[PDB]
Amino acid sequence: KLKAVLFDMNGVLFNSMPYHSEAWHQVMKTHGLDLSREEAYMHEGRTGASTINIVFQRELGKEATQEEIESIYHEKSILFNSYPEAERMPGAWELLQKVKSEGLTPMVVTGSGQLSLLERLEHNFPGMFHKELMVTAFDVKYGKPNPEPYLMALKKGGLKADEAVVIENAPLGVEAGHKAGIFTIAVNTGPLDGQVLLDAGADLLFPSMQTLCDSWDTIML
Ligand SMILES: [Ca+2]
Ligand SMILES: [Ca+2]
Numbered sequence: 001k002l003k004a005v006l007f008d009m010n011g012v013l014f015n016s017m018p019y020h021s022e023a024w025h026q027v028m029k030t031h032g033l034d035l036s037r038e039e040a041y042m043h044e045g046r047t048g049a050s051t052i053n054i055v056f057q058r059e060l061g062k063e064a065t066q067e068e069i070e071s072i073y074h075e076k077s078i079l080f081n082s083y084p085e086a087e088r089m090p091g092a093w094e095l096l097q098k099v100k101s102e103g104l105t106p107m108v109v110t111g112s113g114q115l116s117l118l119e120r121l122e123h124n125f126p127g128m129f130h131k132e133l134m135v136t137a138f139d140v141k142y143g144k145p146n147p148e149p150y151l152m153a154l155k156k157g158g159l160k161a162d163e164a165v166v167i168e169n170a171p172l173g174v175e176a177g178h179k180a181g182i183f184t185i186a187v188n189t190g191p192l193d194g195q196v197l198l199d200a201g202a203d204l205l206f207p208s209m210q211t212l213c214d215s216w217d218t219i220m221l
């Protein structure tokens, strides 16, 4: 049975996705490339380099250079941080309290390298997370949708796949959790159809973090 809950960050702990999607759309627009807001949501969870290389390959037929990757990501971060800071996803704190009260270990598994958000995890969720029990952009070669980040969390936690549950909100992250062989709950906190989360391999679908929190004891029975 359950020992740990592996939380995605963007769109699960923080309501940051309207900002990430907007910044990704606008920065690519400045470089003359097309990435719609919807497409940014479909690429949620990917590393910055992978996101940039997908946009480049499908448009120009070539990948971006390291200098181009660094420059575009640099620009994206500045634009992300120009908006009022992302607030907590409603229900995330209450669920974290619930899982900790039940003796489960909270972990974070994110494709993010966004320092402003990562360094706000303690202030927003006091006493919940530890750096040794987190996987971020800094840990991975491939990143979501590769199961690598979730396999890394299991290792960091000393966990088997059947002792964990994944909470995800995006098709590439759901895929990552599912391909890691972990029970994966999708929470549809964005504008995409819930079908994409289920198609990606989600074992359950809830419309919000708060309803997941309301339903937690029932689903774990
Ligand atoms: Ca996410
Ligand atoms: Ca619908």
Ligand SMILES: [Ca+2]
Residues within 6 Å of the ligand: 198, 201, 202
């Ligand atoms: Ca299914």
